[PDB]
Amino acid sequence: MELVQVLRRGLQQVSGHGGLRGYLRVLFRANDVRVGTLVGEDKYGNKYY
Amino acid sequence: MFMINILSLIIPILLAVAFLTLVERKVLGYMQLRKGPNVVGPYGLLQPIADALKLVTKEPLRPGTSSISMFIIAPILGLSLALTMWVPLPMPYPLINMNLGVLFMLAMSSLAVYSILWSGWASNSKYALIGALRAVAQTISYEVTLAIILLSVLLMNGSYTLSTLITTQEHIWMIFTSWPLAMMWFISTLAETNRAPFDLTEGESELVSGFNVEYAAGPFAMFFMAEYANIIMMNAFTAILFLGASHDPHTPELYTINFVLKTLALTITFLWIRASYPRFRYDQLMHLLWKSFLPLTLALCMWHISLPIMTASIPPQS
Amino acid sequence: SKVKQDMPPPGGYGPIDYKRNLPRRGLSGYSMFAVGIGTLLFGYW
Amino acid sequence: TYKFVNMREPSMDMKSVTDRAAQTLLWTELVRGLGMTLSYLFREPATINYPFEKGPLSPRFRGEHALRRYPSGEERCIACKLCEAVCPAQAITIEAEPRADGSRRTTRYDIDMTKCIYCGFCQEACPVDAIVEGPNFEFSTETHEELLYNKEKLLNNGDKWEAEIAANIQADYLYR
Amino acid sequence: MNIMLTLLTNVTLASLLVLIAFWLPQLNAYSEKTSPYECGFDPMGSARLPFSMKFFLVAITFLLFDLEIALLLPLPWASQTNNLKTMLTMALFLLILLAASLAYEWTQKGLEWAE
Amino acid sequence: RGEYVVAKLDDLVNWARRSSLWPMTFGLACCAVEMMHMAAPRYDMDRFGVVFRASPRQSDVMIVAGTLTNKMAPALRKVYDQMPEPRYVVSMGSCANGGGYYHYSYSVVRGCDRIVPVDIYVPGCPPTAEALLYGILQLQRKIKREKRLRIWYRR
Numbered sequence: 001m002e003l004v005q006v007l008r009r010g011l012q013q014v015s016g017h018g019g020l021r022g023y024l025r026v027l028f029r030a031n032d033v034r035v036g037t038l039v040g041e042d043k044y045g046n047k048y049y
Numbered sequence: 050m051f052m053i054n055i056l057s058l059i060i061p062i063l064l065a066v067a068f069l070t071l072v073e074r075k076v077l078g079y080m081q082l083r084k085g086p087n088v089v090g091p092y093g094l095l096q097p098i099a100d101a102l103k104l105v106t107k108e109p110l111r112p113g114t115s116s117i118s119m120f121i122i123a124p125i126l127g128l129s130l131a132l133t134m135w136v137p138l139p140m141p142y143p144l145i146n147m148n149l150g151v152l153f154m155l156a157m158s159s160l161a162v163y164s165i166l167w168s169g170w171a172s173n174s175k176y177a178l179i180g181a182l183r184a185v186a187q188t189i190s191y192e193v194t195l196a197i198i199l200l201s202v203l204l205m206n207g208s209y210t211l212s213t214l215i216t217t218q219e220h221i222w223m224i225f226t227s228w229p230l231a232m233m234w235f236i237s238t239l240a241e242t243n244r245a246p247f248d249l250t251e252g253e254s255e256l257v258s259g260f261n262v263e264y265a266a267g268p269f270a271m272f273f274m275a276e277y278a279n280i281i282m283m284n285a286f287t288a289i290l291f292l293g294a295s296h297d298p299h300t301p302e303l304y305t306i307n308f309v310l311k312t313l314a315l316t317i318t319f320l321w322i323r324a325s326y327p328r329f330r331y332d333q334l335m336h337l338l339w340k341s342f343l344p345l346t347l348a349l350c351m352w353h354i355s356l357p358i359m360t361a362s363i364p365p366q367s
Numbered sequence: 368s369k370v371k372q373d374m375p376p377p378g379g380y381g382p383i384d385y386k387r388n389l390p391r392r393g394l395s396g397y398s399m400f401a402v403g404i405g406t407l408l409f410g411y412w
Numbered sequence: 413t414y415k416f417v418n419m420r421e422p423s424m425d426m427k428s429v430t431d432r433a434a435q436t437l438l439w440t441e442l443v444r445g446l447g448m449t450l451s452y453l454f455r456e457p458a459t460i461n462y463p464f465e466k467g468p469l470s471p472r473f474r475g476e477h478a479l480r481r482y483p484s485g486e487e488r489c490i491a492c493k494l495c496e497a498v499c500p501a502q503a504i505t506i507e508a509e510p511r512a513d514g515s516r517r518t519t520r521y522d523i524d525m526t527k528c529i530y531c532g533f534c535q536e537a538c539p540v541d542a543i544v545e546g547p548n549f550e551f552s553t554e555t556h557e558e559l560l561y562n563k564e565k566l567l568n569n570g571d572k573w574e575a576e577i578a579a580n581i582q583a584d585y586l587y588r
Numbered sequence: 589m590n591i592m593l594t595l596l597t598n599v600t601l602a603s604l605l606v607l608i609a610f611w612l613p614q615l616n617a618y619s620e621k622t623s624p625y626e627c628g629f630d631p632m633g634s635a636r637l638p639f640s641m642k643f644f645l646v647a648i649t650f651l652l653f654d655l656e657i658a659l660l661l662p663l664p665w666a667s668q669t670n671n672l673k674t675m676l677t678m679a680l681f682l683l684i685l686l687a688a689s690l691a692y693e694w695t696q697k698g699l700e701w702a703e
Numbered sequence: 704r705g706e707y708v709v710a711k712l713d714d715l716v717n718w719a720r721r722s723s724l725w726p727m728t729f730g731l732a733c734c735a736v737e738m739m740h741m742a743a744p745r746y747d748m749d750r751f752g753v754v755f756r757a758s759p760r761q762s763d764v765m766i767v768a769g770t771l772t773n774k775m776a777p778a779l780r781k782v783y784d785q786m787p788e789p790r791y792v793v794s795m796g797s798c799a800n801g802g803g804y805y806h807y808s809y810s811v812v813r814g815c816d817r818i819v820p821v822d823i824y825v826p827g828c829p830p831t832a833e834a835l836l837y838g839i840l841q842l843q844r845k846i847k848r849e850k851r852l853r854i855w856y857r858r
């Protein structure tokens with residue numbers, strides 16, 4: 001059942017990244033698929049995960 | 050619409066070769082703990098486009114110490130033969146029903162020497178002149194083993210009609226009857242396409258590239274296209290020859306799916322072998338076939354010609 | 368304060384394996400030849 | 413003591429010869445490596461997403477040189493020229509002078525980054541921790557002149573990478 | 589027609605690829621590019637000299653074996669004959685002669701890549 | 704007008720060049736080993752479309768990795784002179800950029816620039832693998848800002 005579990009997690013990350021638009025933006029710009037906790041934000045506009 | 054079918058044969062093979070240059074760089078890297086190309090588009094899907102554009106718009110240098118006629122003809126031969134050698138393949142309904150399809154394609158398989166020799170000599174470099182003869186000797190000395198293996202395998206099929214080969218297998222995978230033979234055949238295929246275990250022509254210590262040294266940009270990329278089209282073509286040949294599949298005439302798509310899956314699996318085995326094994330030496334390379342492969346192939350051919358007679362199971366001629 | 372620095376734990380350290388533990392796997396040569404010949408024979412039948 | 417590496421000669425019974433003949437004919441060690449590489453294919457790929465993720469470092473990391481300054485804002489360099497006498501590549505050049513206030517600061521303090529070999533000898537030589545090497549390594553330039561630093565460039569480096577250098581020194585001065 | 593049409597399509601397609609390859613890009617055409625290459629140097633005064641070789645024997649025994657491969661090619665059609673016994677003995681003769689030629693090649697150096 | 708079409712076309716071309724630069728290795732000293740570490744699993748140069756392995760005939764960028772001595776200089780010169788256009792040469796390491804530790808030697812040239820044009824100066828002794836990789840990315844952004852056909856159309 002870990003296969004359907006990882007399928008569910010893969011469909012969960014598309015929700016974690018602010019929906020389809022945010023997910024596609026992250027995939028195309030940052031070459032990343034995973035979502036981490038926002039540990040901080042600098043003045044210039046970079047999110048630290 | 051015949052020409053439309055032709056184009057539907059060439060063009061998809063061209064995209065297949067193009068994305069093979071991505072799947073190899075991904076498979077190899079993952080085999081050696083590398084993520085592979087995933088920056089050009091999603092999961093590196095767009096990467097083959099960029100390198101192709103670069104090589105098209107890269108400067109093609111004319112070899113000053115060369116006769117341009119062969120410097121241009123050799124890519125023509127290598128590429129055109131590689132694609133037209135896809136013509137008689139048994140897709141559920143093969144494009145051209147040539148009565149001697151297997152012999153047709155085996156004969157065209159020998160023609161790659163006729164690009165190798167002109168590339169190696171016309172470019173006029175030491176690495177080129179060495180690698181031309183070395184690679185020529187490789188491929189010609191393995192073509193014989195390919196020939197006896199093809200004959201011995203076919204002696205149970207019935208004829209040289211390559212469409213009836215499916216009808217030969219139908220029940221059981223043909224490898225189950227000729228696994229000793231296929232094990233040689235596959236390896237000889239690995240030798241004929243000049244792959245890392247058996248390449249011997251690149252040899253990036255003493256041959257560097259062997260034949261594609263002075264070739265640059267487009268004519269250079271054409272030989273890669275030939276090389277990584279022969280990969281798919283011979284893996285597909287082996288796939289049908291030994292790894293049979295079902296084919297219901299009312300549903301042609303089923304055999305198509307099974308066959309493409311077999312071809313992908315065999316190409317992945319190609320990449321699998323190259324990602325692990327060391328590279329042969331010319332001494333051992335020809336020792337492998339002259340001393341070891343050829344006697345076993347001769348004996349197996351004798352076995353596979355005597356077997357249908359004693360079992361009273363000669364295959365149907367028509 | 369007492370002097371302290373990067374030191375091994377008081378119980379030393381756990382053993383570090385160095386012997387080649389290359390695994391052994393595979394049927395007997397007779398078994399391999401037998402299974403190959405049996406698959407062959409089924410194929411010919 | 414010593415161990416002989418390859419004296420394990422094989423036996424010659426029927427079982428051993430059959431096994432060796434099978435391994436030679438029915439390629440086995442070949443398949444062994446072919447399956448090991450498969451195990452490495454399904455594993456987790458070791459790859460760091462640059463530049464989004466950077467490699468791990470240490471507080472002792474030696475990188476771009478920089479000229480720090482006291483909490484009051486005054487530059488720590490008293491131009492003792494110890495760092496110039498220490499740099500094995502002689503990439504450091506100082507000219508000193510009695511300033512208007514008087515404190516002997518450097519009229520000229522330039523480090524030839526193309527001559528520098530990034531050893532950290534200057535910082536350990538400095539008796540006031542004036543010269544230091546910041547954690548920055550992201551200063552790959554386009555022109556050779558861009559690399560040849562000046563006193564003002566070193567001061568700007570010390571004023572940009574400053575919280576970094578202060579934090580690293582606070583975490584490392586006890587070791588040194 | 590059909591088959592010939594496929595061969596024509598493939599050769600013209602290949603020629604378009606080479607034409608775009610050799611014509612589209614732009615080159616400054618400066619002289620020192622023409623200097624040949626060998627791992628950093630140029631191939632001195634060679635890459636066309638007669639090639640003192642030894643595997644010529646392997647090259648020629650290739651052809652000598654290729655004739656016999658051509659001889660044994662008709663086998664799949666030949667197995668469909670009434671007098672199977674003669675076909676069996678005589679094909680077996682052909683493969684035995686293959687093996688005997690290889691063996692004489694073997695013991696008398698021969699296929700042993702000359703030194 | 705023509706700027707739209709020519710800019711889109713040359714943007715396509717320079718993107719294709721940018722994501723498929725092929726290094727000509729050329730490691731002379733410890734900078735070579737650091738570059739090799741940069742192609743190791745961790746940083747994985749091969750991900751970015753860079754291929755590390757490249758014969759000098761089929762290559763886009765030379766990394767002068769290590770000290771360049773007098774005896775080497777003619778060989779490096781013949782290698783670069785044969786390099787097809789476009790050819791951007793990056794110099795890694797203080798030794799290759801200019802002088803080095805052995806700046807005041809007798810058989811070491813005082814910089815790759817005195818031998819061959821340098822497009823990106825990568826500092827470090829050695830430049831830690833990711834610094835090299837950042838220099839490669841800087842060259843990629845340089846290829847992004849390329850206006851060949853614009854200048855042709857606006858010559």
Ligand code: SF4
Pocket residue numbers: 477495498499500501502503504523527528529530531532533534535
């Ligand atoms: S690390 Fe600093 S002190 Fe050492 S050689 Fe380089 S510039 Fe001079």
Ligand code: SF4
Pocket residue numbers: 488489490491492493494495496506534537538539540541542543
């Ligand atoms: S050692 Fe420190 S104080 Fe002395 S000249 Fe160098 S930077 Fe200035």
Ligand code: SF4
Pocket residue numbers: 529732733734768769770795796797798799803804827828829830
């Ligand atoms: S710059 Fe440093 S690492 Fe590079 S070659 Fe010179 S001494 Fe070696």
